[PDB]
Design a binder for this molecule. Structure first.
Ligand SMILES: NS(=O)(=O)c1ccc(Cc2c(-c3ccc(F)c(-c4ccc(Oc5[nH]nnc5C(=O)O)cc4)c3)nn(-c3nc(C(=O)O)cs3)c2CC2CC2)cc1F
Ligand SMILES: NS(=O)(=O)c1ccc(Cc2c(-c3ccc(F)c(-c4ccc(Oc5[nH]nnc5C(=O)O)cc4)c3)nn(-c3nc(C(=O)O)cs3)c2CC2CC2)cc1F
Ligand SMILES: NS(=O)(=O)c1ccc(Cc2c(-c3ccc(F)c(-c4ccc(Oc5[nH]nnc5C(=O)O)cc4)c3)nn(-c3nc(C(=O)O)cs3)c2CC2CC2)cc1F
Ligand SMILES: NS(=O)(=O)c1ccc(Cc2c(-c3ccc(F)c(-c4ccc(Oc5[nH]nnc5C(=O)O)cc4)c3)nn(-c3nc(C(=O)O)cs3)c2CC2CC2)cc1F
Ligand SMILES: NC(=O)C1=CN([C@@H]2O[C@H](COP(=O)(O)OP(=O)(O)OC[C@H]3O[C@@H](n4cnc5c(N)ncnc54)[C@H](O)[C@@H]3O)[C@@H](O)[C@H]2O)C=CC1
Ligand SMILES: NC(=O)C1=CN([C@@H]2O[C@H](COP(=O)(O)OP(=O)(O)OC[C@H]3O[C@@H](n4cnc5c(N)ncnc54)[C@H](O)[C@@H]3O)[C@@H](O)[C@H]2O)C=CC1
Ligand SMILES: NC(=O)C1=CN([C@@H]2O[C@H](COP(=O)(O)OP(=O)(O)OC[C@H]3O[C@@H](n4cnc5c(N)ncnc54)[C@H](O)[C@@H]3O)[C@@H](O)[C@H]2O)C=CC1
Ligand SMILES: NC(=O)C1=CN([C@@H]2O[C@H](COP(=O)(O)OP(=O)(O)OC[C@H]3O[C@@H](n4cnc5c(N)ncnc54)[C@H](O)[C@@H]3O)[C@@H](O)[C@H]2O)C=CC1
Lengths: 331, 331, 331, 327
């Protein structure tokens, strides 16, 4: 007989479903940073990669496979066909179009909508019960798009949203105070990037309100210019894009953090993009980052943060802008 | 007073030495994969990045820094100046030239020698007691080069060598047997890549010699073609390079594995590139992969593998070829 | 409304996906529990015992450490409804040896405990894997198989996984090498009658037996037999010194659990139904190297034994069948 | 030659050493938690009971295959503790029937009289992490006997009390304790102070949403959460005879911040003379920044008059006991 059969007596032919499967759709720098972070945190018994670029897809799958000795994730698979994604608990969408010279920003969005038109129904056919974690920008709009196309309930369609913006805020806060970001608390809500809202009232170390110690916190009067911390949350992202061409490491770690809460049913609170119609006087179908409880059914609950009238007004304006763009999209 | 001073009462000024510092020189795909793997395994209290490309360097450092909330490595620093590398326990060189159109292979090696001429003396000035882990290709030759330029004792100059080749071997072994690579034992020794030597006599699951069960193992008459496993160790590396343009994830994980043994003083046995003059009838100053015991002083010991005359001959030929190339290099 | 309802908007009313039960919260069960919690192998840990105060106190002590763990549900009770939907159920329950009590009486008392435990485990987790730790472990694994009616893939004894770990510790002390890099198998019975397979002892795939043919014989000037004597004697020594063993078995069980819960297909020396091998004709469980994954034991490795090694297993099988015939329970 | 020499050609101080003094249930829970978090390259155990000590060391050693801590040693001689970055004291006397509580304290002082100078001789630069009860008093005792600066003498303090608070908070809100923020300060156990003003999820003040929070009028009885912080500890002691797992995990958390220089903020017991109107040499839990030099910095928490009053009373009570102790 074969060497395998001389060495190994088989007890069962059984094939068996994967119990903790994650799919990443889009194997650019962002998708692969999600993949390595997820592999290094042991969140999956099976990792499936999907892309349209066959060579990049196969090469990334093989490079990870060659590291199997150093991992505890026993099955890594890839393909263009969504049958490789079957029975995923969680499917992370990092797929996007590359901006072309001589193209409007609405056209870039529409091109990402058309990608979602192909991706989302295929994901749903093979993993009807999965949670969808949307990373692709524009992330708040494309989370809406994935919800509409999927027909999933809102608990199972999640945008990565302000989880990274909040992590940057805490890094910068930590540098100012000489304290680890874990111990520096502070929330950025609403839109990912330029229009994000820093909730100054929630900024604390050891439950000590910085706003209470320093009432000028987050105003133009402020002698220490704490507003510059939130400006750097937006600008440092543009800075990394200008300096290396894209961001990967921080978003990959952020997504692995959301994946951890979902796969282990932790019910930790993260600022992610959820369907917010009914709150802060928003009457339209838009996704914005508020603090949500993440577990095995996706978003089970969200935290109603006490905002100032000004903070409430910024979210209403964001909802108006997002509904305006959403009405102009073709499904 | 300032918000910091209202919130935080300082007890002590002077900030001491880092106790578990790692430097990565070269922030390409390989250096950054080493960095993320090291960060995700908590092997360092301080990670220093060095490159010549200031924008890429700063951008990569900032991208990692933005992830600090998700890591347990409190200090991430970068610069062109080697003062940022001061007091490193371990310094990983992933710095290399990009092959030019029309450039000869000897010229590419000499250009990497000239990079080492700048890097190594600067590394030594700021971390005179560090272990050097050489990753840059050609890795066996450049480990020799780093030893000569550094003046370090041979215990503290290590090539990543066949640790990755051995991991690929075990991956492929595992696919054939339906067994995790951790439980599939097999050694690839000598040169990294094309001229690596599979030691068929050491291939085992649970201490059961595959060679003893199947004496044709690793010969041309073999009906199961086990030689194809070692062919794929070389060919799969070229395949990933063809498919994505380079390899990163597997080498990053391999280097983090060596770093773990060194930083934690594990005295695990790894196939790494060490100065092998005096063994297997090699009379020249060459570095080849044999199984070494790795700990806090680098290579303390090496394992004397019983080789066939053919296996011994392949290492002698590798030593001759490496000494031939080495005497043609200019310091 | 309530503080909860002012703070949190609920989206959905709330099954565990990765549940582990430990039956018996003695020193052994609790060492298994802390090891499992510290390796993040479960989303739910259930504890069962007959001593309600000890059980509740241990559950509460673990719960109070929740902040430092990533296992969001810890539950206990004497009622097996708390064990419902376990992937894996670890039996560490046992009677305390009395002065003057016969060996057969101790075994029968543990059989009577299994008479209550096993059918209750099966009712609430009909698809679980059973990991039997309670001594005598090879006999009680047989007992659990017969009472459960489970197929043999889903009934596993911890067996010689600990004996093999002790062997490698001792091997490592003699060679100055980490136990991870010291390979050596103890098979057959847990404890006194265990068989060291000298032929499989290797570092880096180098046979110690081939280098030193006296290895494991009485002629041996270095007395390597003393390594296997210490595998048995060091266990008795720890029992004499602290009254019991806990930490090593806890870590060993967490290692098996890791392979099962993550479907790793790593090879461990565990106790499996071995009728049909090495000329054994009776229904006995002995430790051979098994492939562990999500369906329990999928495959065995057929180790090449000497006639002497084969004879020791046959004698063990005869002794175990002799004791098994004298036990009272229904299948 | 020997098999070792046939197999291995030889070519050629611990960097991250932790000592645990006292190998009861508490010391060994600290040890397993530290081993399972990879915080040490060397673990040293010390006790006075030589057989228990040797047995515990051997049991851990037998698990080496499953660990990444390559050297585990024990002995009654403090030479095994040489060059420790961190030394955790879980050593203590067992309460005797009819023995007074001041006598139990003095007996623990006499144990520290032997332990602390030996620890200092072999690891003059170590951080001392004091766990033994009464923890705030015995931290003072270790500081006085050691002559160490206050940055390098740390009590485990309210790190565990704060973890219990967050567990209970989490059960009430259906949220992971990681995401439930709340601080217990001052004395470990009975006289601990819950800072209601800092209780938050996602930076949302529970006090602001529900101003009765932590008053007796409160219809939801949130004070019961802090009552359970104290009572649940007594409950575990009544049910299993002692606590081990939660304190072990808590100490591993402090050790992680110290060994990796994280500068995370923990409620640990530090020398508080000069702060919150305390005028005596006493150790109480306030939020401290922990790193490779021990406590580098304190967070100055804004307390209510009532919270401030509880700490000042604790300082008075602790100084009263401390002036009656014999060195
Ligand atoms: N709330 S929202 O969904 O609508 C939304 C709007 C805009 C952005 C900006 C944006 C884009 C992004 C890409 C593609 C796009 F097409 C758009 C976009 C921009 C503007 C749009 O609306 C219009 N602009 N001009 N005309 C229009 C219109 O359609 O009317 C639409 C899309 C943004 N990516 N991206 C990245 N972030 C990172 C990181 O590391 O944090 C790396 S990249 C960022 C954030 C930037 C770093 C700070 C992120 C968001 F989530
Ligand atoms: N023992 S050695 O140090 O001398 C040595 C020789 C050759 C190589 C081949 C090589 C090179 C490599 C790069 C740059 C170079 F300049 C050379 C090289 C080739 C030939 C050289 O010298 C000559 N020999 N005979 N004539 C000549 C000549 O000078 O023309 C010198 C350098 C190789 N990279 N590289 C990579 N590996 C990976 C991965 O994932 O495993 C990704 S890339 C590989 C391995 C191959 C993919 C499998 C790896 C080695 F380690
Ligand atoms: N293959 S087998 O199932 O039959 C079997 C037999 C004997 C033992 C011995 C044994 C027992 C043990 C307890 C209670 C028992 F009742 C028995 C037992 C053994 C054999 C019996 O056989 C008989 N029944 N009736 N007559 C006989 C007879 O002897 O002829 C009955 C009870 C063992 N515990 N135990 C522990 N190990 C550790 C540790 O850390 O390694 C901690 S404790 C050990 C191992 C010893 C330290 C090295 C472990 C085994 F797995
Ligand atoms: N801040 S302090 O240093 O002064 C101090 C005082 C009292 C205690 C109480 C205490 C003791 C403890 C043991 C021995 C003792 F001797 C004392 C003690 C009590 C009162 C004393 O003072 C007096 N005795 N008689 N009169 C007086 C006086 O007031 O003058 C002295 C010692 C407590 N252990 N212990 C444990 N905790 C746990 C756990 O998991 O949390 C497990 S055990 C606990 C905490 C309680 C379970 C919740 C913990 C502390 F930190
Ligand atoms: N949410 C956040 O905070 C952040 C989001 N991002 C977003 O992540 C996305 C990806 O960024 P990068 O990886 O750098 O981009 P990239 O362009 O490198 O990769 C996107 C990938 O999507 C693939 N793709 C396109 N159409 C596809 C289809 N139909 N099916 C499958 N795959 C398809 C492409 O082939 C490509 O590999 C972008 O939208 C980016 O803005 C980036 C950083 C942070
Ligand atoms: N030993 C092994 O098993 C493997 C080794 N490698 C080697 O790793 C090296 C890097 O690979 P990639 O990341 O793909 O290359 P890359 O070309 O993307 O990056 C190398 C980096 O070195 C930098 N550099 C050049 N001169 C420098 C100097 N004087 N000081 C500091 N930095 C300097 C460059 O700026 C560049 O960022 C290559 O030599 C490659 O062959 C890669 C695969 C496996
Ligand atoms: N397989 C191995 O390598 C090893 C096995 N062991 C075995 O582990 C077992 C436990 O060891 P220790 O924890 O030291 O024992 P222990 O006597 O301290 O605790 C055993 C626990 O079983 C509980 N128990 C008894 N009847 C029960 C029932 N009907 N349902 C549920 N729980 C029940 C007891 O109440 C007790 O809490 C022993 O049989 C021992 O021989 C221990 C060492 C190594
Ligand atoms: N700070 C906190 O939050 C908590 C503190 N603890 C404290 O932990 C301590 C230990 O608790 P257990 O392990 O249950 O106690 P235990 O009495 O079982 O163990 C204490 C050990 O100290 C040893 N010891 C006594 N004198 C010694 C000396 N001169 N040198 C070295 N070792 C010596 C004893 O031999 C014994 O093994 C107690 O003080 C307890 O109150 C307990 C839980 C929580």
């Amino acid at each position: 007989a074969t060497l395998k059969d001389q060495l190994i007596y088989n007890l069962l032919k059984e094939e068996q479903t994967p119990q903790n499967k994650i799919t990443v759709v889009g194997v650019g720098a962002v998708g692969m940073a999600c993949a390595i972070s997820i592999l290094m945190k042991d969140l999956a018994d099976e990792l499936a990669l999907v892309d349209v670029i066959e060579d990049k897809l196969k090469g990334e799958m093989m490079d990870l496979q060659h590291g199997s000795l150093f991992l505890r994730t026993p099955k890594i698979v890839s393909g263009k066909d969504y049958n490789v994604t079957a029975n995923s608990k969680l499917v992370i969408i990092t797929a996007g179009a590359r901006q072309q010279e001589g193209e409007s920003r609405l056209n870039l969005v529409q091109r990402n909508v058309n990608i979602f038109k192909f991706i989302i129904p295929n994901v749903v056919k093979y993993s009807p019960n999965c949670k969808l974690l949307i990373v692709s920008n524009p992330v708040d709009i494309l989370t809406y798009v994935a919800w509409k196309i999927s027909g999933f309930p809102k608990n199972r369609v999640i945008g990565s949203g302000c989880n990274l913006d909040s992590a940057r805020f805490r890094y910068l806060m930590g540098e100012r105070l000489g304290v680890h970001p874990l111990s520096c608390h502070g929330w950025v809500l609403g839109e990912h990037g330029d229009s994000s809202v820093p909730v100054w009232s929630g900024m604390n170390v050891a439950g000590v309100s910085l706003k209470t110690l320093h009432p000028d916190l987050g105003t133009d009067k402020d002698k220490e210019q704490w507003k510059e911390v939130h400006k750097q949350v937006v600008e440092s992202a543009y800075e990394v894009i200008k300096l290396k061409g894209y961001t990967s490491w921080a978003i990959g770690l952020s997504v692995a953090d959301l994946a951890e809460s979902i796969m282990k049913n932790l019910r930790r609170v993260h600022p992610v993009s959820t369907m917010i119609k009914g709150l802060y006087g928003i009457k339209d179908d838009v996704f914005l980052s508020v603090p949500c409880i993440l577990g095995q059914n996706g978003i089970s609950d969200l935290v109603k943060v006490t905002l100032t009238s000004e903070e409430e007004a910024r979210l209403k304006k964001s909802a108006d802008t997002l509904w305006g763009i959403q009405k102009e999209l073709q499904f």
